[PDB]
């Protein structure tokens, strides 16, 4: 945006007092492939996004009229025309970010998220207290529970409240950087957390590592994965203001020497949302978009049970295509559009799974 | 009691100030089966719970002031409200256990006991006469008869007393392990005791996957497991003396190999028990609780028949239970608890496992 700024210094749009679309920081939001002066060339496509358009209706030559660079302007499409006309380039990784999700964006429980502000946020805040106080807490915790319901969305809830930039590191991403044998720049991606400290690594669903490999030729039977991760708790401390955390779905089937304690050392369960839960986590949806309520809030409680926040989640965002309410198709919020999704959305058939937890973490 | 006592001096938990028993070996109880790692992180998540207390509450965030460190005491409700925590969350890894019990600590048939004797005692203190007079007692010896009393205490009060060591296989253990085609962990704790030895090695129910089966063995009375034992009880050498003990609820599902010499040589069966043993039995159970003369020991035992051991140390705790809980009366247990409390139960011991014993030991 302060880049930007310079190519509007150099346009005579107007700014700050024209605010609208063109407004800086809304088309910065699109754009992670660039840098400094690729923001010149995008405004110099963006430039030659008018001249194409007014340029050749014209037909000019040797003679320029001064009206046309009176009449002519640089409209808020052409920007957008020139971001969605992409040249990717800055370096392949996942780079920090931060989220606005906060205990206000987070519905979920109070019991499990309020152990996350003793877990990370007062370790963060007083890493030389606890030396006074002689404690040590640990290097991390580990989620699990039902897939999705936002267990990923609790990390970055406690990214934007410990008021460092957040990175994700998901299965999927070190796949595509491990084909390039680039898991040693997936370990530099926590050294250069650090040197950015302080900021928060969050390892995603790290028993998607595996499953895909099964055994074969890693570091041998166990990953070098695993190896970057021994080696990356090798650097990082309890000192540091770099947090690791865990979030895995099947925090068994891999390599549980890693997960040991001294590694991964908190085991943290994220249960299924309940009746309220269910119905403050759908409170937290319907608020922003239009409501009609003629449903009963409780009474779609009622209906509902043995739906997990995934399921919830959708469940709240797949009604809303159900419902039609703006345009002139339009049906309005209804339990017969809930009631039609019940049927649409999928419940949760599988105690198995829920079981497991359960007896596993009890004793 | 050494690892937490390490944590202890850090802490002002050694000598008892507070209302429970702060010798760790109370808190040692709830315990079992932890290494010094999983302790160590039970203390840590107690200073937590202490942390959860007084810092929240008061919620410094500069200041170190001395008050906050009066106010601190470390209190029992946090190891409480720990081992209610995650504290406790997998079963890890095997485990073998220690033994206390002498003559002192279990009563129980003296003709076994001498019998035992001479199979264990002797070979142990006088070998090398026995080699010189071609007089062999033994070689190892096997333990059947009625089970639910703790035969293997029996086994434990003359290993104690001979001073040799004991070791004992707990059916779990052996019947996990041998679905997963590992007899090897099993031969680590007998190639323990081998190298130890001169040692005494208990195994209940090495066969277990057969005694699951109740009278007779489906497949061949010999499996996997057994193959190392006669290969390992033949192959014990004269350099130590050694005794190796096999024991089962079901004798009859032997192998022919295991009962002859070199392996087994003695063929030990613990007949029901006496009347006159069912009260000692009943004494020294009722005398570890609380207890007053206002009964006769002997009348009990009358009406006691087939009643073994686990059935008259049920006696006593449940009248103690149905009795007075707190009392200032010189009476505690009443005979009005223990004859009443005789005519709900039934003999442990049936008649068609008695048979299939008594015809082998003959045989």
Redesign the interface.
Known sequence: KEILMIHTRNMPLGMSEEEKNKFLEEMADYTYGFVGADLAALVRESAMNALRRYLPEIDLDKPIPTEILEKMVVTEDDFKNALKSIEPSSLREVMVEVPNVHWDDIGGLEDVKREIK?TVE?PL??PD?FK???????KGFLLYGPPGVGKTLLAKAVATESNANFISIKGPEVLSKWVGESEKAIREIFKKAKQVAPAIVFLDEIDSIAPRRGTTSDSGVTERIVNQLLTSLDGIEVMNGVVVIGATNRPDIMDPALLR??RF????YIPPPDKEARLSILKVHTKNMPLAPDVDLNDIAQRTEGYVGADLENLCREAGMNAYRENPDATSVSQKNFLDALKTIRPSVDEEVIKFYRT????
Chains 1, 2 share one sequence.
Not at 132 to 138: A, D, N
Not at 265 to 268: F, P, S
Not at 360 to 363: A, G, I, K, N, V
């Open positions: 003793e007062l805040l007083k207290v006074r106080l002689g404690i040590r807490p640990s304690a001294g050392d908190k085991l943290i596993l973490s009890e004793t």
